C-alpha cells in the first residue's frame, strides 16, 4: 500500500517454513505470502552486491514472463541487505537432481529437459537479454519434473573480484568459448557455447566437464582447437546438435530458434 511501488513486497506479509540451501551468496528459505501463496525467499549477504544497480534492473526483470523461466514476484529493500522473492521449485537444483541414480532416467526424459531450457533461452534472445552464466548449477526443477532457467543476468552485480574476470579463481572457465578466454568478447554466441556444455552435463548424469583437467589446462586444450567427446547415453544425432554450439568461428554457430527446430526433429525420429 502506501509507500510501496509495484516492484516492492512488504516483509510483514511473509511466513517462514523450512530451509532450502545455504552458501557464500546467502541463504534460501521456503514460505507463504498472505497465508495462502507458495514462495522462495533469497536473503542477500551484507557487502556482497552492488544493491542500487540491482534494484533498477529488477524493474525490467518484473516484465519478463515465460512458462520455462523462473518468475520474479518482487524485492524487499527498506532494510538492507535485500530479499529476492520468486515462485517455489520443490525438487531443487538441476545438478543435484541429475546425480541421484535412483531416478533411472530414460533418454526421452533427458531430451525433454534440453527442450525446456532451449524454449526459455529463445525467449531471452527475442528480448535481446543475455544470461552471462548458463550451467546446470543455475537451473531449478518443480513438483511435476519441469526444468526452468534461474539467476539470469545476476553476475553483473556481484562485487567479489575472484568471480568477475577470466583470471579469477572462481570464473566459469569450463563453460566459456575461445574469444571470452583470450579477449573478454561476450555476445549471443557465448550463451550458445554454454548451452552446448549444459546438454553434455544432462547426458553425462552431472559429471564435471573436462573431469581430469584443472581450469588452466582446460583453457590451453580449447585454444588448441580440442573439444569434449560423446556421452554414452547420447545418439549420433544428439551429439551433432551439442557439437554445432562449439565452432571456433562465433558467426558459424546456430541461433536458439534453429536449435529448437533440431531438437523437435530428433524427438519425432527417436519416438
Ligand atoms: C545446485 C545449486 C543449489 O544447490 N542451490 C541454488 C539455491 C541454493 C541451493 C538451492 N537453491 C534454491 C532452491 C530452490 C529455490 C526455489 N525457487 O524454490 C531457489 O530459489 C531462488 C533461486 C535464485 C534466486 O535469485 C534470482 C536472481 C535473479 C533471477 C532469478 C532468481 C531466488 C530464489 N533456490
From Swiss-Prot:
The keyword Zinc applies. Clofedanol binds at residues 86-89, 154. GO terms for molecular function: ATP binding; identical protein binding; non-membrane spanning protein tyrosine kinase activity; phosphatidylinositol-3,4,5-trisphosphate binding; phospholipase activator activity; phospholipase binding; protein tyrosine kinase activity; zinc ion binding. Changing residue 154 to P: In XLA; growth hormone deficiency. It is found in: Cytoplasm; Cell membrane; Nucleus; Membrane raft. Following B-cell receptor (BCR) engagement, translocates to the plasma membrane where it gets phosphorylated at Tyr-163 by LYN and SYK. Predominantly expressed in B-lymphocytes. Changing residue 206 to E: In XLA; mild; interferes with substrate binding. A motif (CAV1-binding) lies at residues 193-200. ATP binds at residues 20-28, 42. It is linked to X-linked agammaglobulinemia: Humoral immunodeficiency disease which results in developmental defects in the maturation pathway of B-cells. Affected boys have normal levels of pre-B-cells in their bone marrow but virtually no circulating mature B-lymphocytes. This results in a lack of immunoglobulins of all classes and leads to recurrent bacterial infections like otitis, conjunctivitis, dermatitis, sinusitis in the first few years of life, or even some patients present overwhelming sepsis or meningitis, resulting in death in a few hours. Belongs to the protein kinase superfamily. Tyr protein kinase family. TEC subfamily. This is Tyrosine-protein kinase BTK. It comes from Homo sapiens. The lineage of its organism: Eukaryota, Metazoa, Chordata, Craniata, Vertebrata. The gene is BTK. The chain holds residues 389 to 659 of 659 of the full protein.
Amino acid at each position: 500500500g502506501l509507500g510501496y511501488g509495484s516492484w516492492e513486497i512488504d516483509p510483514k506479509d511473509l511466513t517462514f517454513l523450512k530451509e532450502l540451501g545455504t552458501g557464500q551468496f546467502g541463504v534460501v528459505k521456503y514460505g507463504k505470502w498472505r497465508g495462502q501463496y507458495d514462495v522462495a525467499i533469497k536473503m542477500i549477504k551484507e557487502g556482497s552486491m552492488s544493491e542500487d544497480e540491482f534494484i533498477e534492473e529488477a524493474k525490467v526483470m518484473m516484465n519478463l514472463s515465460h512458462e520455462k523461466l523462473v518468475q520474479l514476484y518482487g524485492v524487499c529493500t527498506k532494510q538492507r541487505p535485500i530479499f529476492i522473492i520468486t515462485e517455489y521449485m520443490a525438487n531443487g537444483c538441476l545438478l543435484n537432481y541429475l546425480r541421484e541414480m535412483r531416478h533411472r532416467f530414460q533418454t526421452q526424459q533427458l531430451l525433454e529437459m534440453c527442450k525446456d531450457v532451449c524454449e526459455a533461452m529463445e525467449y531471452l534472445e527475442s528480448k535481446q537479454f543475455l544470461h552471462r552464466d548458463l550451467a546446470a548449477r543455475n537451473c531449478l526443477v518443480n513438483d511435476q519434473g519441469v526444468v526452468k532457467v534461474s539467476d539470469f543476468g545476476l553476475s553483473r552485480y556481484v562485487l567479489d573480484d575472484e568471480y568477475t574476470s577470466s583470471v579469477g579463481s572462481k570464473f566459469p572457465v569450463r563453460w566459456s568459448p575461445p574469444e571470452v578466454l583470450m579477449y573478454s568478447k561476450f555476445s549471443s554466441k557465448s550463451d550458445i557455447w554454454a548451452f552446448g556444455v549444459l546438454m553434455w552435463e544432462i547426458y553425462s548424469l552431472g559429471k564435471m566437464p573436462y573431469e581430469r583437467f584443472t581450469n588452466s589446462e582446460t583453457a590451453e586444450h580449447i585454444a588448441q582447437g580440442l573439444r569434449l567427446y560423446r556421452p554414452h547415453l547420447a545418439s549420433e544425432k544428439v551429439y551433432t546438435i551439442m557439437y554445432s554450439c562449439w565452432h571456433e568461428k562465433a558467426d558459424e554457430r546456430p541461433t536458439f530458434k534453429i536449435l529448437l527446430s533440431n531438437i523437435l526433429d530428433v524427438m519425432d525420429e527417436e519416438s
